[PDB]
């Protein structure tokens, strides 16, 4: 009864349709973010999910009161009766404001009219990716928010603390499979839209993809198939069906690895750093089969050496060369490939 | 300073009817539109649509909202848009769309002292495109957004792009992974129905598909599997197990390339440009294995009743015919 008429006095001459000080001054809305779980980063949609406790503090002059309580910890229904700044996400795609089991919003009013308004949000935000060094790349995923209707002359956003300490990521809530959150960078900007200039707060989450899955499923089958295609150099030259079955099948193996590993990626037009590795490893397997066709062209007989020993075929000079050359050149290429892209 | 502004807005809506079009018996109201596109998310060939995210904005003049004395532009809360008249503009391509609702419903009401009102929306829509994929993946596409009023005809409402050809912005900022926006157009026309003649605006893009994804995945192994079917012409005819096994493996690989690429693509009834190529390379693959059965039948079947000349002929002819096949193919569709 006592606290009801305090709240009813605040809503007598209050209009939630207009900004506090609509014709007098700007409205500073201090913002704070507590990231609970930096959720899974979808490569194919070029996006990332993030759960926050998005906090907003600002002073409203009309909500001054004098009562027993210094701060009023109130219901979320009154938050729909008070001016709330129309913050939107400049790169949000499909984001959820949770309401289980009640709308997850708290409104706290101090006795001088300073409002505290936090809400729990699941945000699916856009992250532009540069996959030229896939999978050994690192990129920044922005989280950018500002007012929707209110310009710089009306609503200015700020951070509650020093901006390096104004976005706090929780420790236990990682929720990442591939990437590795190295840290965040908090900055602030200004747009020039067709309706005016808007203050834009910005957080950049700096991710680095761990390459552990993409070595196991792509690189180690591609390396060991090149190691397969070099085993036929140690077979004899008279086994024409044995080396033909051997060589063409490892081309089919590299064909399967080419089209399957490209699927776990967007459909960009350039060649990723994994696609440079698969193309060259295909060329070692391609050249190993053309190596046998030169051996087969100069075989000059059809029978092999019986153990009791007529003239026989010598072990060819182009086979004794490719036992030394092609395993060495693949080892040199791995020194060139793995030092170029891991240094970046 | 501030309570006079509350008193002004409270008597703008005092006696306001949101069921009446502005000048309900008089001239039609002119609604000018302005689109600031954020992104184009996905362009699906299976679902035959595209996702468009845009800042969709509408100017019109309403004399019932005209205020006097206050020199500024009244930027009101988004909840007053439920208490005003707004146009019922829709999209015919619209499969599934939503106005964003985090952290609020992204509406804006900006009243001007002459009665002009801005109504801005941040809309992520999924507009449909029936795509002509007969030159896939070497083709240009045309995706359209069809803005039209629903319940007001051309005697009640009129549409115009605001700014001429500079109405829709943000098109140059769009970087798509496998397309390239060549040109966009702005079309204004009246579309007749049995109920009436309604005004329609049309934003329409031209999407030229980038081809570097398919040179890596589809064209380059189909070349090299076709080339490795030509190793059997440098192998003697006595090696029956060798020349058959590379010919059997090359007809298997062209099968597995076709089965992996039929899972990617929709149920088109025609033959695409990539299907002309994969079935085209399958002929040179399959003729390389019919060639050995032609050689094996002459020497071992019609023996007692040349064998080196047929191989020596086809060492030059089948690389020449396949290089001629790519010359016809890559100059027709490109």
């Amino acid at each position: 009864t006592v606290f009801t008429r305090i709240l009813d006095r605040l809503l007598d001459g209050y209009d939630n349709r207009l900004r506090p000080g609509l014709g007098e001054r700007v409205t500073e809305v201090k913002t704070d973010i507590f990231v609970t779980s930096f959720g899974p980063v979808s490569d194919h949609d070029m996006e990332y999910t993030i759960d926050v406790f998005f906090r907003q503090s600002w002073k409203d002059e009309r909500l001054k009161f004098k009562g027993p309580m210094t701060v009023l910890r109130l219901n979320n229904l009154m938050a729909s009766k008070i001016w709330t700044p129309d913050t939107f996400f400049h790169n949000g795609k499909k984001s959820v404001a949770h309401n289980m089991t009640m709308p997850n919003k708290l409104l706290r009013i101090t006795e001088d009219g300073t409002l505290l308004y936090t809400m729990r949000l699941t945000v699916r935000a856009e992250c532009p990716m540069h996959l030229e060094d896939f999978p050994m790349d690192a990129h920044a995923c922005p989280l950018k928010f500002g007012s929707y209707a209110y310009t710089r002359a009306e609503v200015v956003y700020e951070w509650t603390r020093e901006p390096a300490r104004s976005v706090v990521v929780a420790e236990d809530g990682s929720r990442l499979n591939q990437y590795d959150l190295l840290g965040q960078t908090v900055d602030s900007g200004i747009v020039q839209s067709s309706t005016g200039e808007y203050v834009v707060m910005t957080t950049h989450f700096h991710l680095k993809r761990k390459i552990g899955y993409f070595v196991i499923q792509t690189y180690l089958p591609c390396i060991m198939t090149v190691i397969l295609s070099q085993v036929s150099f140690w077979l004899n030259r008279e086994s024409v069906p044995a080396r033909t079955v051997f060589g063409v099948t490892t081309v089919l193996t590299m064909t399967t690895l080419s089209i399957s590993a490209r699927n776990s990626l967007p459909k960009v037009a350039y060649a990723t750093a994994m696609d440079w590795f698969i193309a060259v490893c295909y060329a070692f397997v391609f050249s190993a089969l053309i190596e046998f066709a030169t051996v087969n062209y100069f075989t000059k007989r059809g029978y092999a050496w019986d153990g009791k020993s007529k003239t026989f075929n010598s072990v060819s000079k182009i086979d004794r060369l490719s036992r030394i050359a092609f395993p060495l050149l693949f080892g040199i290429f791995n020194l060139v490939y793995w030092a170029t892209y891991l240094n970046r | 300073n501030m309570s006079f502004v509350k008193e002004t807005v409270d008597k703008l809506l005092k006696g306001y009817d949101i069921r009446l079009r502005p000048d309900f018996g008089g001239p039609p109201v002119c609604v000018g539109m302005n689109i600031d596109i954020a992104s184009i998310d996905m362009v699906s060939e299976v679902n035959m649509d595209y996702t468009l995210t845009m800042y969709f904005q509408q100017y019109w003049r309403d004399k019932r909202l005209a205020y006097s004395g206050i020199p500024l532009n009244l930027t009101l809360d988004n909840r007053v848009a439920d208490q005003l008249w707004v146009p019922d503009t829709y999209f015919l391509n619209d499969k599934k769309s939503f106005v964003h609702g985090v952290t609020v419903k992204n509406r804006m009401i900006r009243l001007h002292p002459d009665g002009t009102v801005l109504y801005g929306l941040r809309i992520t829509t999924t507009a449909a495109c029936m795509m002509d994929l007969r030159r896939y993946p070497l083709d240009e596409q045309n995706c359209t957004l069809e803005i039209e009023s629903y319940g007001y005809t051309t005697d009640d409402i009129e549409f115009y792009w605001r700014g001429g050809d500079k109405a829709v912005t943000g098109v140059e900022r769009i970087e798509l992974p496998q397309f390239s926006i060549v040109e966009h157009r702005l079309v204004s026309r009246n579309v007749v129905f049995a109920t009436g003649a309604y005004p329609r605006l049309s934003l329409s893009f031209r999407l030229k598909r980038n081809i570097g994804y398919f040179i890596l995945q589809t064209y380059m192994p189909s070349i090299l599997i076709t080339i490795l079917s030509w190793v059997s012409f440098w192998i003697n005819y006595d090696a029956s197990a060798a020349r058959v096994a590379l010919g059997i493996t090359t007809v298997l690989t062209m099968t597995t390339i076709n089965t992996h690429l039929r899972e990617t693509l929709p149920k088109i009834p025609y033959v695409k440009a990539i299907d002309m190529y994969l079935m085209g390379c399958f002929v040179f693959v399959f003729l390389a294995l019919l060639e050995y059965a032609f050689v094996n039948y002459i020497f071992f079947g019609r023996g007692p009743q040349d064998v080196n000349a047929i191989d020596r002929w086809s060492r030059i002819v089948f690389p020449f015919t396949f290089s001629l096949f790519n010359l016809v193919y890559w100059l027709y569709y490109v």
């Epitope: 400049h90 920044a140 960078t185 900007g189 200004i190 020039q192 910005t202 | 970087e175």
Partner: nanobody
Framework: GSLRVSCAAS????????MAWFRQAPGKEREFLAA???????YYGDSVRGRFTISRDYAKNSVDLQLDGLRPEDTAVYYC?????????????????WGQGTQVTVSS
């Protein structure tokens, strides 16, 4: 007197990248001046917020720094950078494409 330093790009479309302006006084100090995101968001340095205005042209693939109110302390070499900023938008080591420099001299 005002000035407008321009930076035309070639060889790569920098629509998805971030193109930025730097300053280096005699004394070997690369200083951040301005940057613009893909979504047209202007990041300014602390000593220059309000004076210098950045404006990109996404069709011509260029970035333009509008120089307004040139005090004589801004006599330095202005560099044009273009990167995807990783630990960036203020760090010079997050821009892997560079201009050659422009000696902008303000005389008192």
């Amino acid at each position: 007197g005002s000035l407008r330093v321009s930076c035309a790009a070639s060889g790569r479309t920098f629509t998805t990248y971030i193109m930025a302006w730097f300053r280096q006084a005699p004394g070997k100090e690369r200083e951040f001046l301005a940057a613009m995101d893909q979504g047209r968001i202007q990041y300014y340095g602390d000593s220059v917020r309000g004076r210098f205005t950045i404006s990109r042209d996404y069709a011509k693939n260029s970035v333009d720094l509008q120089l307004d109110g040139l005090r004589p302390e801004d006599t330095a070499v202005y560099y044009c950078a273009a990167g995807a900023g990783f630990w960036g938008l203020r760090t010079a080591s997050s821009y892997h494409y560079w201009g050659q420099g422009t000696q902008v001299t303000v005389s008192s």
